[PDB]
DNA sequence: ACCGACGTCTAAGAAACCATTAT
């Protein structure tokens, strides 16, 4: 009844302005500043509005709240005080002029009443037509979707967010959609932090990045989306890649895995040729971003298991000098764990008040491991300095671990666990401490949904700034 | 393992490596659906499965009740050696072993047996909620040192009922078999579980590490009779039957140091 | 007449909807 000895991965360190490190992202931003502030890119964040006549006051109010300090009201153990956009991000947040604020057409209300989501997306993109000639006058555009259109937000086979994002993707126009959720949430500091980070990222800046990150390693994620029609179902199975270039920066791209259009698949698993094509595209991207050098070691993360054809294609896609590690992430597992503390003077061995630490990994078999991406983190609490913080306390009594299955690789579990934990903290769209899954899987899933909605935006590589 | 803190899991080791069952040779080929229909119609006191021949654990009279003398060509014995490998390779064998283990575990005890989403649950009865064997579980679910209720009616519900439950699962990992326990709340009737989501969330909201540890200890003691003894408990399925299954399950949950 | 059609059983997840906010 004794398992193998477990080890705990130290909490990943985030890099900020002047190459300073901090575990807490919001605290690091507040005390040191964004990573891209030293590069003066962006020098300013200019905004644009796209809302009906009756709801531009809401956009003005949210921008004014962004420009002014706010204090946390919920989850005070983690969230720090928001000191405004200029104080935190060191760049001004320029309000739009009269020509940079656009009006939604009156036909949008009638289209929404008729329930035609595609017509609503077309009307929104046609409304935003005037800003195409003035793209140089602003950085990020704000979209407000009133609650009166809620019937056209998400029904069978449609996603207004995904459709609008796919339509604005080839126009090189970053957008940020604001609903009534952001305006009627009690904790204003949380919304302010999330929106400010998203706006700074979409403007072209890097809020933070991992501190001790190897430039000779590349990370690839594959996730699938299912679209069902009368004939049957089809799988999107998009891809994503994470790496930093030789110079200062951070690369986050996603691309479709279909070698040619009109290719239909009924299963998430890819073939030999498809895997070879996708990994050749990834290798070409890495070589372009690293002065023509090959990665010393390659990480591929998948939601489903690796078939023999997939493994063979992966091993034949890269050279012999590149190490290949195939890991399958299983989110749902039957295992859960309890933290037990040791003897501390007079107090005997008793269960801990707070759950198992985030970063503990338990080797189960020669090919499977239990990684705890959810758990208690020390050093991030604001109220009690010495008290652990459990992010999912209002949702889960206890954290639920994830399982990693090894299909190829001779290295230890330490490198894989460190990589996954480090990648779970670079979601700029996420305003909390960490994500349960690595950001590669999240971005691949998001791009899979977007491609599923509109299949005409495939065969072009897209940055994370256009889909977060 | 070298140092604290320790990680206490919810997996109970299974020491039994071989099981002995019975084979029913049929003159006419039979499918799984027909066997399930016959089981439902006749309701035998036995456990049956079909990988390539009918494999049963229990008494011969029950099988002769299911199948007439003409259909039964012969009855034999099958030795499932290396039960871990057989469970991993054969799914039907995995389900059969899980059912046999749980039937052995919940024998001669006041705990109900229920099925949801093809997952087995052990449910505390309403009539036996006040019995002494559940005092530790009552203490674990209590608040501020006060005794807590383990069975009652869902608030703001017409006829809905709730009870404390534990989910028992069988898992194979690297040639080792584990019995997996997860505390849960059982809602009767099953099809109206969506009406008590708020109640379940409210009851489970403050079940942190200490409370979950206490609940797991209480459930282990209830299911096995001993807790923290360092030994193994022998459980038998159909002990009086000719074809019976005996399992040796450790009472100390898998733990790790370092 | 070797393969198809179709039932059983696992493991794992996507897809629509609800819910609450960090001892
Ligand atoms: Mg966003």
Q: Where are the domains of chain B?
A: 8-251
Integer CA distances (angstroms), A345 to A101, A386, B258, in order? 66, 19, 20
Report residues near ion ligand 1: CB below 5 Å. Answer: A 198, 429, 468
Beta strands A140-144 and A175-178, pairing class = parallel
- Measured in angstroms, what separates residue A233's CA from nucleotide C13's C1'? 15
Cross-chain Cβ contact A3/B169 below 8 Å: no
Q: Which two three-digit tokens encode residue B185? A: 């709340």
Q: Which of residues 144-173 of A touch strand C (CB under 7 A)?
A: 154-157
Q: List all residues 6 or more positions away from A18 whose beta carbon is below 8 Å from its beta carbon.
A: A32, A33, A38
For A396, the token pair is: 């889960």
Nearest to B17 by CA among B170, B174, B176: B176
Q: Based on the number of CB atoms within 10 Å of its own CB, is A229 exposed (0-12), middle (13-18) or buried (19 or more)?
A: exposed
Using alpha carbons, list the distances in angstroms from residue A373 to A12, A359, A402, B33, B205: 12, 6, 7, 42, 21
| Distance, Å, B33 CA → C8 C1' | 7
Closest CA to B182 of A398, A365, A341: A398
Contact partners, residue B110, CB within 8 Å, separation at least 6: B125, B128, B131, B133
Q: Are B215 and B222 in contact (CB under 8 A)?
A: no
Query: How many other β-carbons are positioned within 10 Å of the β-carbon of residue B114?
Result: 15
Task: Determine which helix (DSSP H) or strand (DSSP E) holds B136, and give its type and residue range.
Answer: helix B135-140
Residues B34 and B36: their CA atoms lie apart, in Å, by: 5
For this PDB entry, the determination method is cryo-EM
Chain B CA closest to residue A6: B258
Question: Looking at residue B243, what DSSP letter applies?
Answer: B
Q: Which nucleotides of C are covered by protein (CB under 7 A)?
A: 7-23
Query: Quick one: tokens of A441?
Result: 């899987």
Helix (H), strand (E) at residue B236: strand B232-237
Nearest to A8 by CA among B252, B10, B2, B253: B2
Q: Which of A198, A205, A208, A122 is nearest to A167 (CA)?
A: A122
Q: Mapping DSSP to helix (H, G, I), strand (E, B) and coil, where does residue B200 land?
A: helix
d(CA A444, CA A463) in angstroms, rounded, equals 12
- State both tokens at A164: 């609008």
Phi, psi torsion values for A129, nearest 5 degrees = -65, -35
Angle separating helix axes A188-203 and A56-66, nearest 10 degrees: 90
Q: Residue holding tokens 């594959």? A: A222
Nucleic chain C contacts, protein chain A, residues 340-379, CB cut-off 7 A: 353-355
Which protein residue has its CA closest to C1' of C7? B33
Q: How far is residue A307 from each of residues A111, A303, A311, B90, measured CA to CA in Å?
A: 46, 12, 6, 20
Does A309 contact B at CB distance below 8 Å? no
- Cβ contacts (< 8 Å) between B10 and chain A: which residues? 335-338
Task: Give the residue among B220, B170, B150 at the shortest CA–CA distance from B19.
Answer: B170
Residues in B whose CB is inside 8 Å of some CB of A read 1-13, 169, 171, 173-174, 180, 182, 204-214, 216, 250, 252-258
Rg (CA), chain B: 20
B198 touches strand C (CB under 7 A): yes
How many angstroms separate the alpha carbon of residue A435 from the centre of ligand 1? 14
CA of A228 to C1' of C17 (A): 18
Phi-psi region of A291 (alpha: psi -120 to 50; beta: other; left: phi over 0): left
Q: What share of chain B is helix, strand, coil (3-state, %, to 5)?
A: 30, 35, 35
Of the residues A343, A351, A395, A405, the best mutation for testing chain B's interface (the one with the most B CB atoms within 10 Å of its CB) is A351
Let me know: does B218 contact B150? Beta carbons within 8 Å: no
User: A162-178: string of b/e by CB count within 10 Å (b at 16+)?
Assistant: bbbbbbbbeeebbbbeb
Reported as half-sphere exposure (CB side, CA atoms, 13 A), residue B196 has a value of 24
Q: Is B138 helix (H, G, I), strand (E, B) or coil?
A: helix
Reduced to 3 states, what is the DSSP secondary structure of residue B186? Answer: strand
Resolution in A: 2.6
- The whole-number Å distance from A154's CA to C17's C1' is 11
Count the Cβ atoms, other than its own, within 10 Å of residue B212. Answer: 23
């Amino acid at each position: 009844s004794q398992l193998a000895a477990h080890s705990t991965i130290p909490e990943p360190l985030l890099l900020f302005k002047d190459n300073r490190t901090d575990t807490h992202p919001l605290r690091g931003l507040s005390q040191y500043g964004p990573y891209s502030a030293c590069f003066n890119l962006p020098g300013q964040v200019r905004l644009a509005y796209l809302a009906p006549t009756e709801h531009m006051r809401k956009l003005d109010a949210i921008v004014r709240e962004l420009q002014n300090p706010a204090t946390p009201k919920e989850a005070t153990n983690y969230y720090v005080e928001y000191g405004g956009f200029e104080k935190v991000f060191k760049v001004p947040l320029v309000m739009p002029q009269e020509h940079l604020r656009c009006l939604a057409l009156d036909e949008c209300h009638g289209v929404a009443a008729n329930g035609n989501g595609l017509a609503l997306a077309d009307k929104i993109v046609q409304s935003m037509s005037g800003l195409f000639r003035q793209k140089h006058a602003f950085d990020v555009l704000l979209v407000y979707l009133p609650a009166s259109w809620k019937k056209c937000f998400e029904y069978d086979g449609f996603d207004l967010h995904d459709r609008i994002k796919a339509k604005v993707a080839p126009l090189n126009l970053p957008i940020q959609i604001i609903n009534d959720t952001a305006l009627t949430r009690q904790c204003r500091a949380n919304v302010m932090w999330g929106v400010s980070v998203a706006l700074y990222a979409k403007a072209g800046g890097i809020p933070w990045k991992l501190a001790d990150w190897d430039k000779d390693e590349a990370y690839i994620g594959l996730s699938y989306a299912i679209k069902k029609n009368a004939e049957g179902q089809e799988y999107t199975t998009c891809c994503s890649q994470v790496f930093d270039p030789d110079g200062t920066g951070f690369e986050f791209v996603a691309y479709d895995t279909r070698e040619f259009i009109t290719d239909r698949k009924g299963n998430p698993y890819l073939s030999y040729q498809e895997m070879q094509s996708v990994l050749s595209k990834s290798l070409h991207l890495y070589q372009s971003s690293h002065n023509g050098r090959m990665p010393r070691k390659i990480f591929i993360h998948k939601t489903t298991h690796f078939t023999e054809d997939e493994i063979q294609g992966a091993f034949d896609s890269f050279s012999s000098s590149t190490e290949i590690e195939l890991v399958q992430i299983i989110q749902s597992t039957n295992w859960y764990g309890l933290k037990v503390d040791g003897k501390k003077g007079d107090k005997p061995v008793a269960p801990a008040s707070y759950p198992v630490d985030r970063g503990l990994y338990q080797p189960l078999t020669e090919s499977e491991c239990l990684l705890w991406t959810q758990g208690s983190v020390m050093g991030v609490n604001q109220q009690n300095p010495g008290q652990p913080v459990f992010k999912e306390a209002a949702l889960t009594p206890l954290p639920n671990p994830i399982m990693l299955r090894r299909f190829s690789g001779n290295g230890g579990w330490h490198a894989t666990c460190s990589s996954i934990l480090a990648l779970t903290k670079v979601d700029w769209n996420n305003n909390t401490l960490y994500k349960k899954l690595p950001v590669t899987l999240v971005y691949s899933q998001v791009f899979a949904d977007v491609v599923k909605q509109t299949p005409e935006i495939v065969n072009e590589i897209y940055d994370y700034r256009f889909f977060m | 393992g070298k140092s604290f803190p320790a990680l206490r899991t919810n997996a109970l080791p299974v020491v039994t490596q071989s099981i002995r069952c019975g084979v029913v040779t049929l003159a006419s080929p039979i499918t799984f659906s027909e066997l399930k229909e016959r089981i439902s119609q006749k309701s035998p006191k036995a456990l049956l499965t079909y990988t390539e021949k009918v494999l049963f654990l229990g008494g011969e009279p029950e099988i002769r009740k299911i199948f007439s003398n003409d259909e039964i060509n012969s009855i034999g014995q099958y030795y499932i050696d290396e039960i871990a490998q057989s469970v991993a390779a054969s799914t039907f064998l995995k389900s059969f072993v899980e059912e046999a283990i749980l039937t052995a575990l919940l024998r001669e005890k006041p705990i109900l047996h229920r099925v949801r989403h093809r997952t087995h649950y052990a449910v505390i009865p309403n009539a036996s909620a006040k019995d002494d064997r559940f005092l530790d579980l009552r203490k674990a679910v209590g608040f501020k040192g006060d005794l807590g209720y383990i069975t009652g009616n869902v608030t703001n519900a017409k006829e809905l009922s709730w009870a404390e439950a534990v989910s028992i699962r069988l898992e194979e990992r690297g040639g080792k078999l584990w019995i997996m326990l997860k505390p849960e709340i059982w809602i009767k009737p099953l099809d109206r579980r969506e009406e008590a989501t708020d109640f379940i969330r409210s009851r489970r909201r403050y079940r942190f590490n200490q409370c979950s540890y206490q609940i797991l200890d209480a459930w282990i003691k209830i299911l096995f009779g001993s807790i923290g003894g360092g030994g193994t408990v022998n459980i038998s399925c159909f002990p009086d039957a000719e074809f019976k299954a005996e399992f040796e399950i450790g009472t100390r949950t898998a733990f790790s140091l370092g």
